[PDB]
Design a protein that fits this description.
late protein (chain E), five-stranded antiparallel β-sheet, virus endocytosis by host (chain E), binds a molecule of 2 linked components (GAL-SIA), binds N-acetyl-alpha-neuraminic acid, globular, homopentamer, 0% helix, host-virus interaction (chain E)
Chain lengths: 264, 271, 272, 272, 267
């Protein structure tokens, strides 16, 4: 796409506001354990590594329809994004394991944190890479994973790619952003691991993330579609007996877009 | 609100100074355990999750009356106070340098008492109207009925473990809205600025700063600060600095007060 | 209160003050053992019998420094005041914490290192043109300080002092006497002082410390005005707790370090 | 050594190189199980019998990339060289660490999560116009590498190599062969290479990782000159250890992740 | 003392100095085993019998470098900036040494871990030291090569300005009782950090892309008196934990690339 000048004047700007609910594994808002995974299980061996249905976090994603419009395209300029419900983690009276010989607080949601978001003018492009090439996803046929397994996928094998085109279906554990593509998407992510690690989270309505690239051009929304993707794991809830479930939080987005003239 | 020009000259600026005491659960300044929660308890099961009265931190909030500007409210333009900036600090951080209280102690009862430690949660908001809240909870079934002074939704549903926009409120009462189930609504709060952080874990070291030298700008991207509707300035916060661990392992939230110095200027608006 | 006018320019319009303050951890006599540490920490049996032993309570370090006298003529329109512009401040003796051979508890079944000084860190300093203004606030309103009557504490106790009760205030006017645990900077005053503090808590937390002679802290406020030294007095306060020393039997003592200050001041005309 | 003149302008004066490098943790064959991990870690009985097993030691990843061929000769007054201006680099597959169902040790009496990959992190990359220059330095001068004759290590051992002995140098000229544990970037050379590295140690330390496609790292030095590609070769090197996988019985293996690079280069006139 | 005038411009007005300093953790002989480590740490039975063994005490590394000879005015070399790095960080990626190990003797060997102490100084004269110790009674007589004060006093657990020195000898001034004197060192820049605790993860960086500016607030760098450049450092990266729980400090070398320029001063 050859990018030309900005379209100026009234109605040259628009904003899109949305939220995405977490996809930790139990993704149905009407059912038990919503916003958590099912109980985590552990493989007996690497050749019998078959996660139960609903114990695997997936990416959240949506395509948003923009106002219908050389051609003109919507250009994403900036985004204000926040994790919602951080204060919900200030809760140590739930039915959990507890400190100091059953006299102390319940364990707060704690441990692994994974936070990412992406804003682009087309689906986020994915690279397959896994800690175990033999992982068997057949307990849940709604998960999108490659049809074949190979040893090489514990590293970067460029023959194993995808696009994030379905909410609550692409496991985070085996799909990551493809850094060799995504020219029309901006993504940002972080991971803090360990077993019981303190979550460290911020929330504010005052921070704007600029989406323009080094040439001053933001994602250009092909077919008037804006693509938003994320995942926000804030830790594990530790049940009385030591059973553990991922806990995720929703993410809010306020995206500013402007009209851009392009060739063709 | 259509915003017009700043009013210039003498008396076009004013400052508001206040503090808010913490609302950790024992919120009566004449009683023992003020500025702490009651002892934390743990639910027998998620269907019988009924916190005891006073064990739940709530937001601190106040509405401050500003100097009246408009004699006639029906005139063509009005003047409003616009919050430009705030200097805010947590008070009494040094109070956490105390390891001789009646607490669990280190090294086979020969070492220090456990300092207040663990979960930290720090947030403040300054706006021209009440902070707008979104309901979201770790347990949709939580039963708040041991304390009918707590403001919570009148019905519960599974969906509130995520973001369900049908469950909203406004922070209109001090010491009443639980932090654990209410957060700032990011889809609103156009006229409020809020800032918050959480550091979790069990025994985590608190990491705290205090200074009188930092100014937080409240002007938005268009150079407009919160506009104080009906000459009311709204200030909200929560500052949990950890748990006090009693001899037997019983634990209580500890909170600290927060100080605010807010600078405001006169702004002409269309009426 | 003070209407600030223009800077005085030219020779002798600038001066610098250099000092250090030794730590006041509880054993504050430089001729005795355990100097720069507290006495052994003790733990209350209950909150109504919370009576710290003499010398187990850290206090603020403070000093007033006399500046060159300026105004002989008090009848003119204007006076001159010293204005603190900036300070270079450092914790001294950080390297002293590189010591794991002292008589302490030790790692790995009595074969490993002695425990280094570790745990709670508390670091604050203040530079102002009058005494640091204090607010009382305590973790335990019933704390009984009467084992050491040299501590400056309020004469009455009340439940409300576990929060901010503005009836309980003081000024930091004595070195080694105001407990850190119950006095903090009063944020509703101190217009003429700049203070900076941090706390890192927990039980055995690694101290994280920096020392350099290359960092200048600007004391000017948002209007470009530094602390103005009333009666030609410069007030410097601090506290620097770097952790606990853990004795063989588990007995623990606060350890503090000295702080150095190099303060630059300039002449400022004010309205009289 | 190289006198740098003006930029060459006009068509074909810019070029970009894009690649990835797979990790070399020890099992470096992409057709075998445990690819991108080390073999099980073993521990020497004593420092004079410290002989790591074949495949348990991480090595640097490296490649030399051919750039569009330029004219080299002794007789011209000036030549053109490729100058590396900037690089976008990222660790790939960070999300793969969101996995606690692998056959591992587990939390809370066999009812909790599997241990995630955790512990030691080591992250470094280099971009230069010639091989990364290495300095030998080891925690144990007697380490015996003879279980794997494909490793490049010095032919003689000496006590002094537990410090900096400048007689022990090399160049990173082979992928998956130079152990991280005994080779580091030589800071006394590498004038024509930019390298960046970090280490976070400890036993079970949480990995702290970031990934984004929005960060450009400028390779120009303080004089505005990037690495100059001798013999039209661009050299890219890295190592990204993200922790250990802890097997059921406590057996542990290094885990590494691939790194992506997008390097921008421009034609530079130099004196010949 | 020194009135600083203008920079000398033109050819040969700049020079660079490059060196490294090997660590002085206690076993400071490069021909012997345990080089770049301390001897085994021992622990006093009481504070009045606190006598570290010979070789268990880290000391500062230091060197004086001779600059090109120059000389009403004189010319001095002015240190403008330094690129400095800890060398051999990657050496800490080693968990197969003869050490204590994780998970019931099946896991990794403990990496070097715990206390970190990192400092460097660049100046135009010896680094000026202040004595300060955690234990005034520490007895250094097991190693008479250590430079320590000849008398002990209670006051030295704080700042006693009567106890000073200059860092004039490599591998001799213990870190545990000497620190930079902040009341002097007008002609030296120093930078230091300490991360304590028992088993703390070391957190270390290495790059050849970071320049530290040595100019002060007035735009003046250290001025090299008698054409001498003084470089000092200490870089402790943790402890090696032996099979039996015996522990030794581990240190790493530091590299320096210092840029200097000619400065006219009043004579
Ligand atoms: C770093 C090192 O020297 N590793 C040794 C290794 C260790 O000494 C041992 O594994 C402790 O972790 O021992 C190796 O040889 C072993 C024999 O010494 C043992 O008696 O028999 C084993 C057979 O199951 C084993 O082969 C090893 O683990 O492979 C050799 C290695 O250099
Ligand atoms: C820091 C200190 O004072 N170190 C002592 C050391 C310690 O008291 C002890 O090793 C605890 O780690 O003791 C030294 O002398 C030892 C004798 O006290 C012991 O009875 O026998 C030991 C056998 O080697 C040894 O002689 C020491 O370990 O060298 C002396 C040292 O200054
Ligand atoms: C990753 C994996 O293979 N998980 C499997 C688990 C675990 O091996 C054990 O529960 C120990 O957690 O066992 C199952 O019978 C189960 O719980 O449904 C099958 C499941 O596929």
């Amino acid at each position: 796409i050859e990018v030309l000048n900005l379209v100026t004047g009234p109605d040259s700007i628009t904003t899109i506001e949305l939220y995405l609910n977490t996809r930790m594994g139990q993704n149905d808002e009407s059912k038990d354990n919503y916003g958590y995974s099912e109980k985590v299980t552990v493989a007996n061996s690497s050749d019998q590594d078959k996660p139960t249905s609903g114990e695997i976090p997936t990416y959240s994603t949506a395509r948003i329809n923009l106002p219908m419009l050389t051609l003109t395209m919507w250009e994403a300029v900036s985004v204000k994004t926040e994790v919602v419900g951080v204060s919900s983690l200030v809760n140590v009276h739930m039915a959990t394991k507890r400190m100091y010989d059953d006299k102390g607080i319940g364990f707060p949601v704690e441990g692994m944190n994974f936070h990412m978001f992406a804003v682009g003018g087309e689906p986020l492009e994915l690279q397959f890479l896994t800690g175990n090439y033999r992982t068997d996803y057949s307990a849940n046929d709604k998960l999108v994973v490659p049809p074949i397994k190979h040893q090489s996928t514990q590293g970067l094998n460029p023959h194993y790619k995808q696009k994030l085109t379905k909410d609550g279906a692409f496991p985070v554990e085996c799909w990551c952003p493809d850094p060799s593509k995504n020219e029309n998407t901006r993504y940002y992510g972080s991971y803090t691991g360990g077993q019981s690690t303190p979550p460290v989270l911020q929330f504010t309505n005052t921070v704007t993330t600029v989406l323009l690239d080094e040439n001053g051009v933001g994602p250009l929304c092909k077919g008037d579609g804006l693509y938003v993707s994320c995942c926000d794991i804030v830790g594990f809830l530790v049940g009385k007996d030591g059973d553990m479930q991922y806990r995720g939080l929703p993410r809010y987005f306020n995206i500013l877009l402007r009209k851009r003239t392009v060739r063709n």
